[PDB]
Amino acid sequence: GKLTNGALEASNVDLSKELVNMIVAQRNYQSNAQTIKTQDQILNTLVNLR
Amino acid sequence: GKLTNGALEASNVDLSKELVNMIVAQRNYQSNAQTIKTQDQILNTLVNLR
Amino acid sequence: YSNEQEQVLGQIVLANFANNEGLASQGDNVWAATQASGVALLGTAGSGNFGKLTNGALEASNVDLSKELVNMIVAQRNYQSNAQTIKTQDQILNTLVNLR
Amino acid sequence: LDENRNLVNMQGMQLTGYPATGTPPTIQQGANPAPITIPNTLMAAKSTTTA
Amino acid sequence: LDENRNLVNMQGMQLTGYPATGTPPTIQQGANPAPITIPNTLMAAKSTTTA
Amino acid sequence: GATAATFSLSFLNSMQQNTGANNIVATNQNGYKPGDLVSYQINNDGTVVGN
Amino acid sequence: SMQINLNSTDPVPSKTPFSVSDADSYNKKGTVTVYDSQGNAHDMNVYFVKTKDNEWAVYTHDSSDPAATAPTTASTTLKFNENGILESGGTVNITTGTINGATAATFSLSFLNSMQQNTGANNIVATNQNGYKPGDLVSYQINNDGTVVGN
Amino acid sequence: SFSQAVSGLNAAATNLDVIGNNIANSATYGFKSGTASFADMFAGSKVGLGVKVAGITQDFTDGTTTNTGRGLDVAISQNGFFRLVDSNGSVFYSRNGQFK
Amino acid sequence: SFSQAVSGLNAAATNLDVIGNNIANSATYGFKSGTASFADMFAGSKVGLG
Amino acid sequence: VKVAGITQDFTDGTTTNTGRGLDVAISQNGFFRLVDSNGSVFYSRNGQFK
């Protein structure tokens, strides 16, 4: 099609959904961190089993 | 029908209801922001649960 | 009509049910009835249970702001009470582990 | 008013109601609820009978 | 108000109470407690007796 | 094709003004026509009142 | 079953004789959609003409079958008392038509508890038939009684 | 929960973008109003999860017309649209009548 | 004990989801209010659990 | 005391509006029919296809 004569196209970046993903993946990372914390406490008790 | 001979039709933009929607959707956005703030504080306590 | 004529092209019907709460959402504001909803109480506007509608006007939400935020605060505090309760429970079970 | 002569919403669902039949058509009370149409068809060329 | 003409809760239990009988019906003090109904039935076509 | 109905008619407490104008105070009859359930309310006594 | 509330203050229809296309020849027209063994939806136009006080000639017309002529005979005649209580003329067996090689189905039709309003407007209260068409298992639920209920 | 939150957030953001674009073409010639619609979501069992946008809803009410100096700028008063053609012969429409 | 805890926790979470969905369709056209109800549990001997 | 096995649950989930039109999730009961290089039939509710 006909282009943008004398005009330049910037990014297609939206702000809101990016920060939403930044919050949600952070909380998923926190879930992973607490999960591995519980795993390491379980293995600590497995050490404390002996 | 008979058109506007030698006359050009501008926008049908009203001012008052546009600014009303600008206020109301802003306040709805503030409600969403405080809602997600409370959500993130809840998930902060869920992190602080462990 | 162009020849100074007026002919009715139809008339929209209306209905009520035995239970308004017995509806079922079908995506948007679209309601499929249930067995607990009631049979189609048919009729026309302005007669009996039906009244004159809003000609050229659209009804928005019935949302109040204050009581919604009040419930948002109160259920959050109840959630905090549940969280501290389960915190005390887990500390009790931690001591039960530390019992041995 | 859609291309299929009916008043449809953004979801395309046609609103129903009482139809009118006859010449001239009037809303009858004992009909099935029908999707209300706005036809652009030509009117009935009726001659003078009672004046 | 459910389909069985009674004021029922979310559990469907009907609330009971004193019924009214007669024409015109009044609440009597010596009845069994009855589930209170809101009937959509037609009223009694009463002619003029005392004016 | 109705029936010729005979009713009792009382002019109780109809007073004679010493001066003034002949004026009907009030009229009342116990005869009416149905009449159907439109809505319903309950007062502060637990009585379900039909409208 | 067809229950209908009818105004008593209505006059006799002056348009003579009766025609199915003459709305002024009657006062009220009903319509009930029934189904046969071939499952065709026969829509009975039920016309009611006030002959005199409390007496109404009730005509049935299978409008879904175009080969049926204009009914000039009475299917029944609803006759009532002074108070407007349902007295007589409220039950008739009506034979339907044949659509696409179906069978003409005869059904019992009751006008039970059809009341006569002292004043108002002629209004059908309710219609009901035990005839339907399948119909298949969409879903299933169980209430608080252990009964598996089919949807 | 967070799905309804991001749904309402993006709906409010997109509606405000629609409103700001309607403000951006204030007092331009040949403009018809356009707004946004709303949508909801289907019930899971009987719950309902999400509130969405049904799409852009253009409105075609009559606007304001100014007398101009030329005679070759003719707006359309009633229902009607000017037929335009591109270099590739495709048919388009515009109520704007400014042509030289 | 923990049954009542998870019952109250999921009830508070589901009620807050109901409230947030009611906020999500603020100012939409054709909206009627919807809330959540509560329930309790039958007594074991005379206790009540949940 | 043992394990009877894996119990999959098929309740309705959360759906997000996406930018493309070629990513169509399945709302009601239904499954997309896929095929491998060996012609075997598989199923997936995911509708992201290019």
Author numbering:
A (entry chain G), B (entry chain A): 353 to 402
C (entry chain F): 303 to 402
D (entry chain F), E (entry chain K): 101 to 151
F (entry chain K): 252 to 302
G (entry chain f): 152 to 302
H (entry chain A): 1 to 100
I (entry chain F): 1 to 50
J (entry chain a): 51 to 100
Lines quoted from the article behind this entry:
The axial structure consists of three morphologically distinct regions, the rod, the hook, and the filament from the proximal to the distal end, with a few minor components. The function of the hook is a universal joint that transmits motor torque to the filament in any orientation relative to the motor axis. The rod is a drive shaft that penetrates the peptidoglycan (PG) layer and the outer membrane and connects the hook with the rotor of the motor. The distal rod and hook show distinct mechanical properties, although they share the same helical symmetry and repeat distance and are composed of similar subunit proteins (FlgG and FlgE) with 39% sequence identity.
The previous cryoEM map of the St-hook also showed an unassigned elongated density between the D1 domain and the D0 helices. The shape and position of the density is very similar to the density corresponding to the l-stretch of the Cj-hook or that of the St-rod. The D0 helices and the l-stretch of Cj-FlgE were well fitted into the EM density with slight modification. The amino acid sequence alignment indicates that the l-stretch of St-FlgE is 18 residues shorter than that of Cj-FlgE. Consistent with this, the density of St-FlgE corresponding to the l-stretch is shorter than the other two and terminates at the position expected from the sequence. Thus, we built the model of the Dc region based on the Cj-FlgE structure and constructed a full-length St-hook model. The subunit interaction mediated by the l-stretch is not as extensive as in the distal rod. The l-stretch extends to the −5 direction and interacts with the inner surface of the D1 domains of the FlgE subunits in the −5 and −11 positions but not with the subunits in −10 and −16 positions. In contrast, the l-stretch of FlgE is shorter than that of FlgG and only interacts with the inner surface of the −5 and −10 subunits. These interactions probably reinforce the hook structure while allowing the axial compression and extension of each hook protofilament for the bending flexibility of the hook.
